[PDB]
From a paper:
Upon photoisomerization of its chromophore from 11- cis- to all-trans-retinylidene, the photoactivated rhodopsin (Rho*) undergoes a complex sequence of structural changes, leading to the signaling state of the receptor, metarhodopsin II (Meta II). Crystal structures of Nb2 in complex with native rhodopsin reveal a mechanism of allosteric modulation involving extracellular loop 2 and native glycans. Nb2 binding suppresses Schiff base deprotonation and hydrolysis and prevents intracellular outward movement of helices five and six – a universal activation event for GPCRs.
We tested this hypothesis by comparing crystal structures of ground-state bRho, bRho*, and opsin in complex with Nb2 to a published structure of bovine opsin. Second, to obtain opsin/Nb2 crystals, bRho/Nb2 complexes were bleached in the presence of hydroxylamine (NH2OH) to induce hydrolysis of the Schiff base, followed by crystallization. a–c Superposition of the crystal structures of bRho/Nb2 (red), bRho*/Nb2 (orange), and apo-opsin/Nb2 (sky blue) complexes at 3.7-Å, 4.25-Å, and 3.7-Å resolution, respectively. Superposition of bRho/Nb2 (red), bRho*/Nb2 (orange), and opsin/Nb2 (cyan) revealed overall similar arrangements. This observation differs from the published opsin crystal structures, where Glu247 on TM6 is displaced and closely juxtaposed to Lys231 on TM5, forming a new electrostatic interaction and stabilizing TM5-TM6 in an active conformation. In a similar manner, Nb2 forms crystals with opsin, stabilizing a Meta I-like conformation.
Numbering used by the authors:
A (entry chain A): 1 to 147, 151 to 230, 241 to 323
B (entry chain B): 1 to 144, 149 to 228, 241 to 323
C (entry chain C), D (entry chain D): 1 to 114
Amino acid sequence: MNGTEGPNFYVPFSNKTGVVRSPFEAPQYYLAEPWQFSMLAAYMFLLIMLGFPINFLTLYVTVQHKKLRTPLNYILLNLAVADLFMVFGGFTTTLYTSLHGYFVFGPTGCNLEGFFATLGGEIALWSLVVLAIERYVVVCKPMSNFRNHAIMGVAFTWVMALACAAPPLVGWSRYIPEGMQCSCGIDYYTPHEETNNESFVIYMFVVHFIIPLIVIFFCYGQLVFTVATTQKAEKEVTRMVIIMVIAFLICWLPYAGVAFYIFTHQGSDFGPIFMTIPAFFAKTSAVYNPVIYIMMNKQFRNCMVTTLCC
Amino acid sequence: MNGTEGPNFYVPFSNKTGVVRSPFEAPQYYLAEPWQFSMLAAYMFLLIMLGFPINFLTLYVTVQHKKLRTPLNYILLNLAVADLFMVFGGFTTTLYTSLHGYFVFGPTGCNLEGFFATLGGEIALWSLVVLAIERYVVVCKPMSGENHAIMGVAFTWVMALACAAPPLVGWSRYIPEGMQCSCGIDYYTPHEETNNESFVIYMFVVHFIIPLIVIFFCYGQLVFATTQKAEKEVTRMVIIMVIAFLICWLPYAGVAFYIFTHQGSDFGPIFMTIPAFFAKTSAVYNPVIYIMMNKQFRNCMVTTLCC
Amino acid sequence: QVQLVESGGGLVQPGGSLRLSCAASGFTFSKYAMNWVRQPPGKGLEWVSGIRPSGDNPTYADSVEGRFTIIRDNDKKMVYLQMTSLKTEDTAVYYCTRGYGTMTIEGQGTQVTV
Amino acid sequence: QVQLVESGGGLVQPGGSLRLSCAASGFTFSKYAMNWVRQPPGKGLEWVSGIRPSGDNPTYADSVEGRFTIIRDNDKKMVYLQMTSLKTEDTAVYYCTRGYGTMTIEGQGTQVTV
Ligand SMILES: *[C@@H]1O[C@H](CO)[C@@H](O[C@@H]2O[C@H](CO)[C@@H](O[C@@H]3O[C@H](CO[C@H]4O[C@H](CO)[C@@H](O)[C@H](O)[C@@H]4O)[C@@H](O)[C@H](O[C@H]4O[C@H](CO)[C@@H](O)[C@H](O)[C@@H]4O[C@@H]4O[C@H](CO)[C@@H](O)[C@H](O)[C@H]4NC(C)=O)[C@@H]3O)[C@H](O)[C@H]2NC(C)=O)[C@H](O)[C@H]1NC(C)=O
Ligand SMILES: *[C@@H]1O[C@H](CO)[C@@H](O[C@@H]2O[C@H](CO)[C@@H](O[C@@H]3O[C@H](CO[C@H]4O[C@H](CO)[C@@H](O)[C@H](O)[C@@H]4O)[C@@H](O)[C@H](O[C@H]4O[C@H](CO)[C@@H](O)[C@H](O)[C@@H]4O)[C@@H]3O)[C@H](O)[C@H]2NC(C)=O)[C@H](O)[C@H]1NC(C)=O
Ligand SMILES: *[C@@H]1O[C@H](CO)[C@@H](O[C@@H]2O[C@H](CO)[C@@H](O[C@@H]3O[C@H](CO)[C@@H](O)[C@H](O)[C@@H]3O)[C@H](O)[C@H]2NC(C)=O)[C@H](O)[C@H]1NC(C)=O
Ligand SMILES: *[C@@H]1O[C@H](CO)[C@@H](O[C@@H]2O[C@H](CO)[C@@H](O)[C@H](O)[C@H]2NC(C)=O)[C@H](O)[C@H]1NC(C)=O
């Protein structure tokens, strides 16, 4: 066989040799070199290391100031929350798993890793859907005198993200160790028809990928003929919405591509490095988002220093 | 049978019940409540969490700027280095050990925890000896810059390794303290063959009393324009740096003496562990002062951050 | 509700032949793969053979390389293992597992005593 | 170079008496404490008794509470265990350990067969 399927897991490595074992039992050092597992932990450490401070500052500064109550700030606080949920919920588990080289926590340990990895991306995705719609309403001016509405659109992101991330935990689809058996994600590997994860992958790529991206570029297409001082501040922040997407596309496409590749070519010959590289790469979502919010948005940066330098 | 001594370890808990085990084998949840071990990890996490960013920024900003080459900045960069050695060398080990509830790494794992804990304090101590002498030379003007500072910064590492290295050499030793999560010098067992009894004298003499004398000896000299205002605030920060160091390290140093005096007495695991973990704030508080009080630095920090 | 039958097998001559069966029920059969795994009286399970869902490429262990052969019927939902030129060590209880794994549904299999 | 002698002990009457000895050599004796620990033929070591360096407060297990008694000589470097009103289960190999622990330095021991 090419890969080795089990009840809980699927190891992308042939069990002709006899070496293959469950990643919920023993370490998976036969997959890749043991130093590469340490390299994961090294990488995954820095995500946790720069995760909390940047997100917690972004969380604190926004709430501390009675100002900063624009739709942009609500969403980018929502991300700062979700990014901390990623760090403490997900990254912790995968950083520990990288040390041991397997999910020593267990199948439930895998769920945590995959859950907040799925939330993080979906809450980032559905937030870019909100940001896409929000600038269409103000710039193109379809609906007049229509700017608490923001908090409703921020609750939208969590409603849709849990529509994606929760069902695996419910038992429709499932989180399963990916690549080096250190991260977790949706089962693209086994058909798992009883679990029905085949149908979920359609549901996910349709409802939680294609529809979002349509709405984004549908809104982006409106401002092709389009592109006072507040509009300059609008422009830079509307430009940041583009850069926020550009980053999101660079981040999540590779993983999403490989996820489709495996779903199409189930049972094919692919190693543990195939999926793990773009998977761990996509966990930069926790850190890059606020760095833009500081970097580009001048209004925030000023207030950040105010909080730091009291 | 108040405490339970072993080859590697000493557990501050009677083995009348039969429950006591090595902290290099099994978890020590019989000592304290298992949630208290999680509370350690929680506390110890935040030391690592605020450790790297504050120290790395302080390290980066100082080196990045071609300015900031005053003796103050050399020492407070030296601390920023040692504080990162604490975080990555020591705190990592004790944060992991707090999870499992015992030194799963092993006796060598204990050495790492105790080594950088000893360096951190000694490099902070001997740095305050340097700062004490440095302001005496400028203010009181007994003897009428850059190279001299780097020599006095190398002094701190020479003396700190005189304290921290010998345990690893095998004179004295690092041994799990309190909840068996941190490590430090053996104040508990006589272990005459290791000769840790004599080390404790050596340590409290050479690596505590002599430093503190030199500090207050210099402080005693200063009992009786604008550049001097900048001198004053930075010389005031030297006082605040000591004030913090005294608040930090006295409790641990006191309990260390108490146990050394009253070896084999009745004392629980919380006795030593509280002031021990409290003294690991040395990594974080030092630079916070260097930012807080020193205006000259703060400005340059924002320059680096806000490019 | 899954149900794998384990028909075919019994007492056979040393160096004889035997055709095994595995009637699958209660899942989309053609949508995934099936294997054969045996239980030697002494040591742990040996992965005998395997085959893809389409059935294009079969895979065999070195132990039974060329002697055994695997083939499946998607329409009838069956998996066969034509065993030829048998040996004493081939004596085991044969199970037909799903996916690509040694995880055996049901039990009993078929005691092929050589 | 440490050397703990394990003198005293042997064959004794059920409900008899016996005085044990432990001549210490090769360390600051009064600077350390000393214990007594026995090896039952079947189960693991039992911590019998212990005493402080000064010798002020001796400590005994519930097993031998009142029957046994411990005392040490700092000048001669010796530790004694006066065992009285013995039992069948007191049959064991007795070791005198250092510190406060059941860690026994290699010793002749003393097979006290009751
Ligand atoms: C990748 O591929 C490898 C290939 O080896 C595979 O490893 C094997 O995994 C299987 C699990 O499916 C293991 O099978 C079990 O082995 C048990 C014994 O294993 C130990 O002991 C043997 C010696 O006996 C050693 O050689 C070995 O190293 C182990 O230390 C065995 O007991 C199991 O079989 C019993 O239990 C099952 C389940 O209940 C039962 O169905 C069987 O009938 C059997 O019970 C028997 O019952 C009778 C009646 O009551 C009783 O009298 C008899 O004593 C029992 N039989 C025995 C043998 O005692 C089971 O076969 C297998 O050992 C692994 N191989 C190795 C090398 O150990 C990996 O799992 C694959 N990786 C993945 C995750 O895909
Ligand atoms: C705190 O106090 C407890 C009190 O029990 C100590 O626990 C005992 O530690 C001793 C240390 O030597 C153990 O002694 C050894 O036991 C072995 C067998 O133990 C297992 O098997 C028995 C049944 O046979 C079970 O009842 C038991 O639970 C264990 O699973 C023996 O094989 C050993 O004998 C060998 O070594 C000795 C060394 O002196 C030789 O003299 C012998 O000839 C032989 O080679 C040995 O006797 C004892 O088993 C432990 N008891 C328990 C709880 O199981 C703790 O160690 C102590 N803690 C600290 C930190 O000091
Ligand atoms: C492990 O995965 C590899 C792919 O990574 C599988 O190889 C594939 O095997 C099938 C069946 O033999 C090939 O399909 C056939 O290809 C030929 C030539 O292109 C074509 O004429 C036939 O009509 C048919 O489509 C497939 O091409 C091949 N893939 C490649 C490019 O190597 C392999 O079977 C897997 N191993 C097992 C047994 O799981
Ligand atoms: C455990 O330590 C306690 C002290 O913390 C010891 O108690 C002392 O015992 C001496 C006699 O040996 C008395 O003179 C003291 O007054 C006691 N101290 C107090 C105030 O409790 C105790 O003996 C120790 N246990 C052993 C057996 O070593």
